Amino acid sequence: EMVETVCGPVPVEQLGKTLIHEHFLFGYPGFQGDVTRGTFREDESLRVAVEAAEKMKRHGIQTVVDPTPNDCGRNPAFLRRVAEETGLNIICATGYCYEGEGAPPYFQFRRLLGTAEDDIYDMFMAELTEGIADTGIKAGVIKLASSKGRITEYEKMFFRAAARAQKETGAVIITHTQEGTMGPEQAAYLLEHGADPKKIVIGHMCGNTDPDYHRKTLAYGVYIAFDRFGIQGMVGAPTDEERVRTLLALLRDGYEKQIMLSHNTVNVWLGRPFTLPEPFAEMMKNWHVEHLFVNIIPALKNEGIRDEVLEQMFIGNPAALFS
Amino acid sequence: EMVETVCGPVPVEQLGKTLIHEHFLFGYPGFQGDVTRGTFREDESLRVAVEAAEKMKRHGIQTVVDPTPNDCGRNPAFLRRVAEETGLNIICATGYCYEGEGAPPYFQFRRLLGTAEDDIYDMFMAELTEGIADTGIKAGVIKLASSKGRITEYEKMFFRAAARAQKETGAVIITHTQEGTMGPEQAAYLLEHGADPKKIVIGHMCGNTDPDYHRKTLAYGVYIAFDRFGIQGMVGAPTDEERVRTLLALLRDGYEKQIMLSHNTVNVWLGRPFTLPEPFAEMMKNWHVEHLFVNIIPALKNEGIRDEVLEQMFIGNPAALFS
Ligand SMILES: [Fe+3]
Ligand SMILES: [Fe+3]
Ligand SMILES: [O-]
Ligand SMILES: [O-]
Ligand SMILES: [Zn+2]
Ligand SMILES: [Zn+2]
């Protein structure tokens, strides 16, 4: 009936139209060491995050899942200030980034101690049921991530702890796949350890342009997310035109009850400000929270996708996922 | 004539007896994501660090260089509290850990922007000449580190930025070597880029037991540090007996004006508390700040090392290094 948000429990039936994957804050691990030249300006960051929440509200969004990993600048008290300023429901996560771009030294060391998987499970349970730090905010999802072409031994510790925690709590699992790989393997691995496919979203599936790969993942009964609309030319990503082509193939095959859409925006960057060089800057110009509603959804409608199917992806699927 | 400490400038002639490499706080990258179960307990941490400082003071130590990297939990404000409570001179560092167990994702991304080396130089210069974050504290050394068997292209960016910053400021460079490798390569690369060997300490040289490797490094005119006394059977370390054997060969060759000694202790660990499993726990039992003075130094004297040589390593060499 309920899901934990940054403002406490909200009835699932009230989530409404939802973006399954956006970041209000995000930092690449190591941003903390650039604090002198990259200090966190709370007021301007809150202003920029509140504006991003406003743009989402302008298109009917009532709920955002922000799955920023623990080691990438997750800040639940900050998310709570965005939610209270805007009325947006925000669901945050507990979990670590994948080994390639995460901060693995700490839990790699706890492997040596022999307690890592159990420590991670303990962290998951505490943040799902008690609260994150002293904020009193519980995560509503477990975030998992794997590397390109491989679910590493480090990553598999988190996958096994997440399956253990889901059995105890019923929590939703959201994943990150790297460069269109390991979607089927992630689903198989979680299910083999007892995870509920109806409570799993395999993320970044738009990174693969082969519908056979998607159908193989969807056969496990899980949700998949085309959650990187607007990201072109970077992190190995395909174009939006390719995303739409792949998505249309699945929707015309009747998979609408298993698909959700998002942008994976980073609305405030942690660390030192930057500007993208001119090759990437142009390719990335549609990477913002209005892109699905101004550009992508109209293109899907012009391809014949009906309102009922869009409502299933944005409203029905997140309601079913969290209940 | 001055060096920056966590309390401000101190005359170099007043540093006195020095430990060149100890950590009051330290955390493996990723400890920040374990905040719920691994919160920082300042008071007990300050008490533990202060008791560590008081044990050092009982053996004559007046100054400690704490080179905790920026991405490993460096906390200059905390160090100032240890220094104010105890009267110890504490010199802190600016720098990042090596790629293998550091947090490279952030400055790896800035290499894509094409600004990484220049941003790191800017960070070094700000923290050496302006202040760290809003603490008003300046670093007194630049910390560099390389991986096992390689100075990676990521690491080389910091080496080049450090050489550039040293030319501007005259700041001392302290390095980490991994598992007894890259000593000569570090000295050669730094000198290639204009660094001053009289201002460089190649660290963890005790990780290599071949005196020819040390002599190869010493030929560059740099200092070397036997700075991991007490660490046995972890991170590839040799035994203290092997350290003493290597050190004795070098001292009998007349190298005392290039050698400094330390433990590389970690007196308060960041993140979740732990206890070492019992194979490592026994090998590591002498890893504390009194080990050099209770065990190692008496063993050196029994092998004929004179007080004048010990005073050169602990007092004369730090004074020459920082002036
Ligand atoms: Fe994301
Ligand atoms: Fe160290
Ligand atoms: O992501
Ligand atoms: O170290
Ligand atoms: Zn992701
Ligand atoms: Zn080191």
XYZ file of C-alpha atoms and ligand atoms in Angstrom:
652
model
C 0.000 0.000 0.000
C 2.879 2.347 0.924
C 6.323 3.228 -0.406
C 8.982 5.148 1.530
C 9.815 8.544 0.006
C 12.158 11.263 1.241
C 9.056 12.624 3.020
C 7.975 9.349 4.611
C 5.425 6.803 3.376
C 3.165 7.687 0.444
C 0.386 5.367 -0.823
C 1.480 3.689 -4.046
C -1.897 4.557 -5.597
C -0.970 8.259 -5.283
C 2.391 8.113 -7.107
C 0.773 9.089 -10.393
C 2.941 9.855 -13.402
C 6.524 8.857 -12.578
C 10.060 9.196 -13.911
C 11.837 5.985 -12.904
C 15.440 7.257 -13.143
C 16.668 10.842 -12.625
C 19.451 12.354 -10.505
C 18.961 15.661 -8.719
C 22.561 15.473 -7.412
C 25.396 13.285 -8.685
C 29.168 13.122 -8.401
C 31.731 10.764 -9.873
C 33.664 9.094 -7.012
C 36.632 11.325 -6.193
C 34.629 14.574 -6.329
C 35.071 14.867 -2.552
C 38.813 15.325 -2.997
C 38.241 18.408 -5.182
C 36.396 20.210 -2.364
C 38.574 23.334 -2.392
C 37.727 24.207 -6.001
C 34.441 22.270 -6.081
C 32.619 23.114 -2.862
C 28.929 22.191 -2.609
C 26.871 25.403 -2.764
C 23.671 24.271 -1.075
C 21.497 27.270 -1.961
C 22.237 27.464 -5.680
C 22.088 23.663 -5.893
C 18.682 23.669 -4.201
C 17.532 26.385 -6.598
C 18.679 24.387 -9.635
C 17.166 21.151 -8.311
C 13.858 22.841 -7.463
C 13.740 24.255 -11.000
C 14.243 20.783 -12.473
C 11.407 19.562 -10.248
C 9.240 22.424 -11.578
C 9.897 21.481 -15.205
C 8.850 17.917 -14.409
C 5.664 19.152 -12.727
C 4.894 21.197 -15.860
C 4.463 17.875 -17.723
C 2.352 16.118 -15.089
C 5.112 14.288 -13.211
C 4.214 13.665 -9.573
C 6.942 11.189 -8.586
C 10.673 10.748 -9.288
C 12.866 7.785 -8.417
C 16.378 9.107 -7.761
C 18.717 6.103 -7.594
C 21.961 7.999 -6.934
C 24.378 5.422 -5.418
C 25.747 5.743 -1.902
C 29.258 6.294 -3.295
C 28.166 8.906 -5.908
C 26.980 11.739 -3.688
C 23.572 10.475 -2.524
C 22.060 13.138 -0.258
C 18.606 12.245 1.114
C 18.232 15.330 3.332
C 18.837 17.467 0.246
C 16.235 15.498 -1.711
C 13.840 16.101 1.179
C 14.333 19.870 0.770
C 13.536 19.593 -2.946
C 10.405 17.570 -2.164
C 9.118 19.943 0.502
C 9.706 22.968 -1.730
C 7.894 21.364 -4.688
C 5.428 18.723 -3.504
C 7.153 16.167 -5.742
C 7.370 12.635 -4.352
C 11.017 11.489 -4.410
C 12.058 7.886 -3.785
C 15.766 7.393 -3.110
C 18.012 4.321 -3.168
C 20.534 2.289 -1.215
C 23.385 0.713 -3.175
C 26.807 1.186 -4.699
C 28.011 1.998 -8.211
C 29.522 -0.623 -10.489
C 33.182 -1.442 -9.962
C 34.448 0.358 -13.070
C 33.305 3.868 -12.109
C 32.447 3.328 -8.435
C 34.461 3.477 -5.202
C 35.243 -0.244 -4.617
C 38.324 -0.056 -2.270
C 36.218 0.059 0.902
C 34.069 -3.037 0.411
C 36.921 -4.845 -1.356
C 38.797 -4.494 1.936
C 35.790 -5.853 3.845
C 35.958 -8.939 1.613
C 39.357 -9.620 3.186
C 37.710 -9.372 6.603
C 35.171 -11.940 5.362
C 32.122 -9.837 6.272
C 31.495 -7.802 3.083
C 28.321 -9.448 1.787
C 26.844 -9.532 5.289
C 27.867 -5.895 5.887
C 26.202 -4.839 2.639
C 23.013 -6.707 3.579
C 23.090 -4.976 6.963
C 23.446 -1.615 5.219
C 20.552 -2.452 2.868
C 18.241 -3.472 5.724
C 19.135 -0.440 7.854
C 18.500 1.986 5.047
C 15.304 0.256 3.885
C 13.716 -0.107 7.314
C 15.400 2.225 9.859
C 16.797 5.277 8.071
C 19.783 6.632 6.175
C 22.375 8.179 8.514
C 20.410 10.333 11.020
C 17.975 11.729 8.416
C 15.147 9.316 9.241
C 14.697 8.810 5.476
C 14.402 5.216 4.298
C 15.323 4.223 0.765
C 12.487 2.855 -1.334
C 14.676 1.002 -3.830
C 17.855 -1.054 -3.871
C 20.256 0.140 -6.596
C 22.544 -2.415 -8.286
C 25.063 -2.052 -11.111
C 27.307 -4.246 -13.234
C 30.306 -3.598 -15.456
C 30.658 -3.897 -19.214
C 30.366 -7.543 -20.272
C 30.726 -8.897 -16.740
C 29.036 -8.953 -13.356
C 32.238 -8.792 -11.303
C 32.809 -10.628 -8.027
C 32.613 -7.289 -6.205
C 29.271 -6.515 -7.888
C 27.894 -9.996 -7.218
C 28.249 -9.376 -3.481
C 25.747 -6.527 -3.813
C 23.452 -8.583 -6.053
C 23.320 -11.397 -3.483
C 22.756 -8.985 -0.579
C 20.004 -7.245 -2.567
C 18.187 -10.528 -3.205
C 18.462 -11.327 0.508
C 17.097 -7.891 1.429
C 14.246 -8.017 -1.085
C 12.930 -11.291 0.372
C 12.794 -9.658 3.821
C 11.329 -6.307 2.768
C 9.737 -6.652 -0.664
C 11.842 -3.683 -1.787
C 12.103 -2.769 -5.463
C 15.452 -3.364 -7.204
C 16.629 -0.973 -9.926
C 19.761 -1.776 -11.880
C 22.395 -0.139 -14.039
C 23.740 -2.015 -17.087
C 26.955 -0.823 -18.725
C 26.968 -0.214 -22.511
C 24.055 -2.508 -23.304
C 25.440 -5.660 -21.653
C 24.433 -8.148 -18.936
C 20.672 -7.462 -18.933
C 19.703 -11.133 -19.190
C 22.495 -12.152 -16.812
C 21.353 -9.649 -14.168
C 17.786 -10.966 -14.325
C 18.899 -14.611 -14.175
C 21.288 -13.964 -11.282
C 18.744 -12.126 -9.108
C 16.002 -14.677 -9.768
C 18.334 -17.592 -8.996
C 18.939 -15.975 -5.597
C 15.206 -15.614 -4.987
C 14.439 -12.081 -6.147
C 10.928 -11.258 -7.392
C 10.923 -10.440 -11.145
C 7.873 -8.210 -10.652
C 9.989 -6.092 -8.295
C 13.050 -5.681 -10.591
C 13.821 -3.006 -13.184
C 16.780 -3.747 -15.447
C 18.056 -0.277 -16.312
C 19.859 1.369 -19.248
C 18.377 -1.240 -21.583
C 18.202 1.461 -24.277
C 22.009 1.036 -24.493
C 21.371 -2.062 -26.641
C 19.749 -1.727 -30.088
C 19.038 -5.451 -30.657
C 15.405 -6.334 -29.795
C 16.402 -9.987 -29.322
C 18.545 -8.929 -26.344
C 15.557 -7.071 -24.893
C 13.185 -9.987 -25.501
C 15.636 -12.304 -23.722
C 15.595 -9.972 -20.700
C 11.812 -9.495 -20.788
C 11.300 -13.280 -20.770
C 12.374 -13.316 -17.115
C 9.231 -11.314 -16.227
C 11.184 -8.222 -15.092
C 10.714 -4.588 -16.016
C 13.197 -2.913 -18.352
C 13.950 0.804 -18.533
C 14.755 2.954 -21.559
C 16.047 5.513 -19.102
C 18.788 7.457 -20.912
C 16.845 9.484 -23.498
C 18.885 12.523 -24.488
C 22.287 10.916 -23.803
C 23.991 10.638 -27.188
C 27.632 10.133 -28.120
C 28.847 9.462 -24.556
C 29.212 6.363 -22.325
C 28.844 4.298 -25.507
C 25.215 5.353 -25.894
C 23.191 4.944 -29.091
C 21.190 7.830 -30.579
C 17.648 8.737 -29.551
C 16.525 7.705 -33.036
C 17.895 4.223 -32.333
C 16.274 4.179 -28.875
C 12.881 4.990 -30.401
C 13.313 2.353 -33.119
C 14.079 -0.306 -30.496
C 11.279 0.857 -28.192
C 8.724 0.830 -31.015
C 9.648 -2.765 -31.894
C 8.923 -3.875 -28.316
C 5.726 -1.839 -27.928
C 4.397 -3.196 -31.229
C 5.183 -6.681 -29.850
C 2.977 -5.937 -26.830
C 5.580 -5.463 -24.083
C 4.141 -2.166 -22.757
C 3.421 -3.571 -19.268
C 7.164 -4.187 -18.722
C 8.706 -0.923 -19.992
C 9.390 2.422 -18.307
C 11.090 5.559 -19.716
C 13.388 8.217 -18.214
C 16.403 10.435 -18.992
C 18.991 9.682 -16.285
C 19.571 13.443 -15.968
C 22.140 14.936 -13.606
C 20.646 18.247 -12.624
C 23.357 19.399 -10.204
C 26.895 18.071 -10.667
C 28.994 17.576 -7.541
C 32.569 18.802 -7.595
C 34.026 21.438 -9.900
C 31.758 22.873 -12.638
C 32.590 21.986 -16.221
C 31.443 22.495 -19.803
C 31.347 19.687 -22.355
C 33.657 20.010 -25.388
C 31.924 20.881 -28.629
C 31.570 17.336 -30.108
C 29.715 16.003 -27.059
C 27.982 19.283 -26.152
C 25.921 19.312 -29.358
C 25.076 15.600 -29.206
C 23.970 15.964 -25.558
C 21.838 19.091 -26.019
C 18.514 17.281 -25.441
C 19.644 15.744 -22.111
C 17.191 17.440 -19.748
C 14.009 16.537 -17.890
C 11.610 17.912 -20.556
C 13.018 15.897 -23.483
C 10.636 12.921 -23.157
C 7.607 15.211 -23.138
C 8.623 17.815 -25.719
C 10.321 15.505 -28.244
C 10.117 11.749 -27.593
C 6.438 11.268 -26.644
C 5.271 13.322 -29.679
C 7.456 11.129 -31.916
C 5.944 7.965 -30.404
C 2.432 9.351 -30.959
C 3.299 10.193 -34.570
C 4.366 6.551 -34.931
C 0.911 5.459 -33.764
C 1.469 4.758 -30.049
C -1.822 5.318 -28.206
C -2.374 7.352 -25.026
C -3.346 4.173 -23.142
C 0.086 2.645 -23.833
C 1.914 5.784 -22.689
C -0.231 5.884 -19.549
C 0.656 2.247 -18.905
C 4.370 3.032 -19.055
C 4.315 6.216 -16.939
C 1.493 5.479 -14.465
C 0.379 1.851 -14.492
C 3.836 0.263 -14.482
C 5.268 2.243 -11.528
C 2.060 1.586 -9.571
C 2.362 -2.157 -10.213
C 6.115 -2.146 -9.549
C 5.783 -0.653 -6.065
C 2.756 -2.718 -5.019
C 62.472 29.062 6.818
C 58.758 28.286 7.341
C 56.542 25.282 6.646
C 52.746 25.312 6.711
C 51.193 23.184 9.454
C 47.550 22.677 10.376
C 48.047 25.567 12.839
C 49.807 27.888 10.387
C 53.453 28.562 9.531
C 56.082 27.026 11.816
C 59.849 27.629 11.461
C 61.555 24.601 9.943
C 64.311 24.794 12.584
C 61.578 24.084 15.181
C 60.153 20.857 13.668
C 62.614 18.801 15.728
C 62.190 15.042 15.920
C 59.759 14.021 13.172
C 57.736 11.043 11.979
C 57.501 11.498 8.199
C 54.461 9.257 7.481
C 51.571 8.560 9.908
C 47.783 8.774 9.495
C 45.594 10.079 12.308
C 42.480 9.354 10.226
C 42.216 7.202 7.139
C 39.458 5.662 5.052
C 39.490 3.509 1.937
C 37.551 5.233 -0.881
C 33.932 4.176 -0.589
C 33.774 4.502 3.210
C 31.446 7.474 2.638
C 28.755 5.148 1.254
C 28.711 3.176 4.535
C 27.731 6.270 6.551
C 24.633 4.713 8.151
C 26.662 1.981 9.883
C 30.008 3.826 9.772
C 29.323 7.302 11.079
C 32.302 9.406 12.135
C 32.438 9.573 15.961
C 34.494 12.742 16.411
C 34.938 12.664 20.188
C 36.185 9.102 20.462
C 38.238 9.678 17.302
C 39.833 12.813 18.766
C 40.536 10.914 21.983
C 42.176 8.027 20.105
C 44.237 10.388 17.923
C 45.275 12.466 20.952
C 46.412 9.341 22.806
C 48.407 8.404 19.701
C 50.005 11.854 19.705
C 50.803 11.576 23.416
C 52.582 8.245 22.883
C 54.654 9.837 20.124
C 55.501 12.793 22.375
C 56.767 10.414 25.063
C 59.447 9.309 22.583
C 60.470 12.864 21.695
C 58.349 13.360 18.561
C 57.530 17.035 17.987
C 56.213 16.848 14.393
C 54.198 14.391 12.284
C 53.675 14.536 8.523
C 50.194 13.158 7.869
C 49.898 12.618 4.097
C 46.333 11.252 4.032
C 45.159 11.700 0.405
C 42.245 13.961 -0.501
C 40.193 10.968 -1.700
C 40.955 8.936 1.478
C 39.231 11.012 4.148
C 41.736 13.849 4.709
C 40.377 16.140 7.435
C 42.600 19.173 8.123
C 40.139 20.685 10.607
C 40.315 17.471 12.642
C 44.120 17.496 12.498
C 44.167 21.051 13.869
C 42.188 19.830 16.884
C 44.758 17.097 17.544
C 47.552 19.672 17.184
C 45.901 22.275 19.432
C 45.188 19.666 22.123
C 48.697 18.160 22.135
C 51.153 20.800 20.910
C 52.261 18.501 18.076
C 53.214 20.084 14.761
C 51.105 18.329 12.104
C 51.780 18.884 8.400
C 49.074 17.680 5.989
C 49.062 16.970 2.257
C 47.317 17.748 -1.011
C 47.075 14.825 -3.403
C 45.140 11.794 -4.543
C 45.655 8.079 -3.948
C 46.953 5.757 -6.654
C 44.513 4.434 -9.225
C 44.338 0.881 -7.861
C 42.772 1.729 -4.491
C 41.909 5.420 -4.901
C 38.855 7.156 -6.351
C 39.894 7.821 -9.996
C 36.453 8.205 -11.703
C 36.278 11.985 -11.108
C 39.614 13.115 -12.551
C 39.415 10.397 -15.208
C 36.266 12.188 -16.387
C 38.094 15.531 -16.424
C 40.710 13.986 -18.689
C 37.859 13.664 -21.188
C 37.174 17.378 -20.744
C 40.874 17.928 -21.478
C 41.418 19.938 -18.287
C 42.424 17.304 -15.696
C 46.150 18.062 -15.352
C 45.490 21.805 -15.208
C 42.665 21.335 -12.675
C 44.934 19.219 -10.449
C 47.681 21.852 -10.627
C 45.052 24.453 -9.667
C 43.995 22.294 -6.721
C 47.615 21.847 -5.546
C 48.285 25.587 -5.786
C 45.078 26.526 -3.964
C 45.688 24.111 -1.105
C 49.396 24.963 -0.788
C 49.074 28.779 -0.997
C 45.426 29.728 -0.227
C 43.783 27.101 1.983
C 41.929 23.795 2.052
C 38.150 24.218 1.677
C 37.125 26.919 4.200
C 39.499 25.806 6.962
C 42.184 28.386 6.190
C 44.672 25.505 6.592
C 47.371 25.039 3.970
C 48.980 21.748 3.023
C 52.718 21.543 3.591
C 53.420 18.636 1.212
C 52.141 17.277 -2.093
C 51.229 13.581 -1.941
C 51.717 11.376 -5.011
C 51.128 7.654 -5.514
C 51.658 4.986 -8.166
C 50.297 1.491 -8.835
C 52.032 -1.888 -8.756
C 54.590 -2.063 -11.557
C 53.350 1.051 -13.339
C 52.884 4.794 -13.065
C 49.566 4.845 -14.921
C 48.542 7.626 -17.279
C 46.043 8.817 -14.628
C 48.792 8.896 -11.991
C 51.212 10.665 -14.350
C 48.826 13.642 -14.530
C 49.310 14.172 -10.793
C 53.090 13.734 -11.103
C 53.282 16.399 -13.818
C 50.994 18.760 -11.878
C 53.097 18.205 -8.754
C 56.350 19.044 -10.533
C 54.749 22.216 -11.899
C 53.424 23.153 -8.448
C 56.781 22.436 -6.814
C 58.591 24.820 -9.183
C 56.162 27.570 -8.118
C 56.113 26.927 -4.373
C 59.115 24.816 -3.449
C 56.723 22.424 -1.710
C 57.942 19.002 -0.582
C 56.670 15.953 -2.490
C 55.947 12.730 -0.575
C 55.146 9.591 -2.545
C 53.532 6.188 -2.120
C 55.034 3.196 -3.960
C 52.970 0.014 -4.284
C 54.495 -3.351 -3.286
C 58.115 -2.301 -3.686
C 57.872 -1.062 -7.280
C 58.493 2.143 -9.304
C 60.903 3.899 -6.912
C 63.454 4.752 -9.611
C 60.691 5.440 -12.129
C 59.074 7.954 -9.767
C 62.314 9.825 -9.172
C 63.191 9.780 -12.875
C 59.788 11.031 -14.016
C 59.616 13.790 -11.427
C 63.138 14.969 -12.277
C 62.270 14.838 -16.004
C 59.533 17.410 -15.299
C 61.740 19.743 -13.281
C 61.218 18.559 -9.708
C 63.987 19.012 -7.141
C 65.331 15.727 -5.708
C 66.247 17.431 -2.420
C 62.489 18.078 -2.017
C 61.234 14.536 -2.816
C 60.623 11.604 -0.461
C 60.018 8.291 -2.231
C 57.812 6.415 0.214
C 57.276 2.750 1.173
C 60.740 1.865 -0.093
C 60.871 -0.779 2.664
C 58.484 -2.782 0.475
C 61.510 -3.850 -1.590
C 64.211 -5.994 0.024
C 66.888 -5.664 -2.683
C 69.373 -2.929 -1.641
C 70.327 -2.414 -5.302
C 66.787 -1.177 -5.925
C 67.254 1.318 -3.096
C 70.676 2.390 -4.407
C 69.135 2.867 -7.852
C 66.604 5.217 -6.248
C 69.136 6.930 -3.981
C 71.318 7.803 -6.987
C 68.711 10.396 -8.021
C 69.529 12.321 -4.834
C 66.018 11.941 -3.386
C 65.089 10.914 0.135
C 63.674 7.437 0.692
C 61.366 6.355 3.502
C 61.297 3.048 5.378
C 57.865 4.106 6.531
C 55.852 0.901 7.097
C 57.542 -0.582 10.165
C 55.057 -2.922 11.833
C 53.118 -3.745 8.660
C 53.752 -7.444 7.998
C 51.932 -9.917 5.776
C 49.471 -7.403 4.294
C 49.574 -5.316 1.073
C 52.533 -7.475 0.013
C 54.720 -6.256 2.860
C 57.989 -7.903 3.869
C 58.773 -8.594 7.515
C 60.331 -6.072 9.878
C 63.369 -8.360 9.961
C 63.761 -7.913 6.208
C 63.278 -4.147 6.593
C 66.030 -3.954 9.215
C 68.363 -6.055 7.062
C 67.843 -3.737 4.069
C 68.166 -0.608 6.213
C 71.391 -1.842 7.841
C 72.983 -2.470 4.433
C 72.198 1.109 3.388
C 73.315 2.721 6.654
C 76.623 0.845 6.503
C 77.028 2.293 2.982
C 76.693 5.871 4.295
C 73.199 6.778 3.099
C 71.796 8.058 6.409
C 71.308 11.617 5.108
C 68.764 10.322 2.563
C 66.709 7.976 4.787
C 63.729 8.577 7.050
C 61.705 6.102 9.148
C 58.011 5.825 10.062
C 55.136 3.338 10.602
C 52.295 4.508 8.305
C 49.889 3.872 11.187
C 46.169 4.422 10.819
C 45.074 5.498 14.272
C 41.362 6.055 13.542
C 39.721 4.171 10.677
C 36.871 5.829 8.792
C 33.720 3.909 8.000
C 32.424 0.889 9.856
C 34.544 -0.489 12.728
C 36.299 -3.804 12.148
C 38.780 -6.248 13.661
C 41.416 -8.030 11.600
C 41.126 -11.811 11.160
C 43.705 -13.731 13.167
C 46.327 -14.596 10.486
C 46.790 -10.891 9.785
C 46.032 -9.823 13.362
C 49.155 -11.539 14.693
C 51.438 -10.384 11.878
C 50.244 -6.797 12.419
C 50.479 -6.673 16.212
C 53.429 -4.232 16.279
C 51.745 -1.720 13.913
C 51.553 1.211 16.323
C 53.341 4.524 16.832
C 55.745 3.256 19.537
C 57.138 0.313 17.548
C 60.151 2.161 16.093
C 61.198 3.391 19.546
C 60.501 0.290 21.644
C 61.587 -2.442 19.208
C 63.273 -1.303 15.978
C 65.680 1.374 17.254
C 67.079 -0.843 20.076
C 67.634 -3.588 17.500
C 69.450 -1.072 15.295
C 71.661 0.019 18.192
C 72.461 -3.600 19.040
C 73.709 -3.829 15.437
C 76.013 -0.839 15.980
C 73.954 2.109 14.694
C 75.070 5.218 16.594
C 72.847 7.864 18.168
C 74.257 10.460 15.763
C 72.904 8.467 12.806
C 69.452 8.087 14.381
C 69.359 11.836 15.060
C 70.263 12.516 11.422
C 67.313 10.441 10.202
C 64.714 11.755 12.669
C 65.848 15.389 13.078
C 68.484 16.503 10.586
C 66.827 15.007 7.502
C 63.359 16.567 8.066
C 65.021 19.918 8.740
C 66.983 19.692 5.480
C 63.991 18.411 3.519
C 61.720 21.314 4.479
C 64.405 24.017 4.110
Fe 21.594 6.895 -13.059
Fe 50.210 6.392 4.117
O 22.961 6.058 -14.192
O 50.154 4.639 2.965
Zn 23.231 4.122 -14.188
Zn 50.962 5.032 1.081
